[PDB]
Symmetry: D2
Subunit: 121 residues, 4 copies
């Protein structure tokens, strides 16, 4: 009781994906996270006709973090169109690190890793 | 039939949750969606400046979280509660999610997206 | 004066080095700096879409690499060599480095930044 | 030994390029310099914007130079701050570098040379 339920994150990222705006890649992504108060926040990717103005699902999740009063990320699970875990892109790694620190857990294809190991400095 | 005052009040309230430690320039934004619901966003900076998210980026994220639709009016405010013009990046996002008819409060009054980003 | 044919050829020429494997939509841009020198840029996309650099972003980098200055005229082209409008984000970059009196070729003719990004 | 990366050359080149840096919003100027797989030296400076999130990192500028001069693959990169000390690429830039140099790209870091495989595990 109190351990991260990666399954809850997975299923929440999957459901969030329903709303993905990715008509340029046709590659919908969902993400879900636990904040340090135990609440669940989600994001989706949002693409633009100009490719460099697209927002990663994780970006939207960071926006949801602050919309709902802030805090710190503790656990994050990004999913593709099949529900499989996705590795965050380097940009999202930096956003994740800033709002999670080195101890943030990320679900990856090779299991749970920390931001300490995904973004060494 | 936009209650522009409800938008400014909403954007000011949203603004409390702003993450701008680097600039100390917090921003909030509120918008109406074509079904009438009110969404808001706040800016979220990053130690790497080019990673920062405008408040309108957040509102767009919130647009989709809450099931999509088209933006119909938007109001961005500064730490004093005064209208802010969206930057060029944010103009392209709003064009994309509201089209040319979307209305935006500006320092000099209401302007459509057609006027703010001519094509 | 400004020679617009020289920029459109220089842009097209530059477009050859485009890195656009994701959109298959290569872009070139050419512009004059206030000291008469000609600079170009191409788009460079990325597996993570939102990390793509626009042609105009590349040119802006070329501007500073080559010693600074203000942009005076700019011509962006698509794969056919036709004038392309800068995206809203690039308008904000152009404005920062050319100001309101910077001229851009558009499908409809020369327009200034002041027109294309009202403040 | 002949053909090893000369990190001195990269560091001096990055200090030099840093003089054209446009950083009025942070007052944190950055220069970067790279060897391409044909041996040519490229550079980049950061370019800030009134909208913070439209800022270009030094590594972005260098990537644009890579293509402007004919493409190729990055082989070694040295980023510098205002004191000429080694600087770590932010996350977005590690993603650009990865895409144009792959896992075996060498980056100089405060703790010595590291590869992109080490800096951005996949
Ligand atoms: Zn990402
Ligand atoms: Zn903006
Ligand atoms: Zn652009
Ligand atoms: Zn960077």
């Amino acid at each position: 009781m109190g351990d991260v339920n990666w399954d809850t994150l997975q299923k929440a990222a999957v459901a969030a994906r329903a709303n993905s705006y990715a008509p340029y890649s046709n590659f919908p992504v969902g993400v879900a996270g636990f904040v340090n108060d135990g609440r669940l926040i989600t994001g989706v990717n949002v693409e633009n006709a100009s490719y460099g103005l697209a927002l990663c699902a994780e970006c939207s999740m960071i926006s949801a973090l602050y919309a709902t009063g802030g805090g710190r990320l503790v656990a994050v699970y990004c999913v593709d169109g099949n529900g499989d875990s996705l590795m965050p892109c380097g940009r999202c790694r930096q956003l994740l690190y800033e709002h999670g620190g080195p101890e943030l857990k990320i679900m990856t294809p090779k299991g749970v890793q920390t931001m300490a190991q995904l973004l060494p400095q």
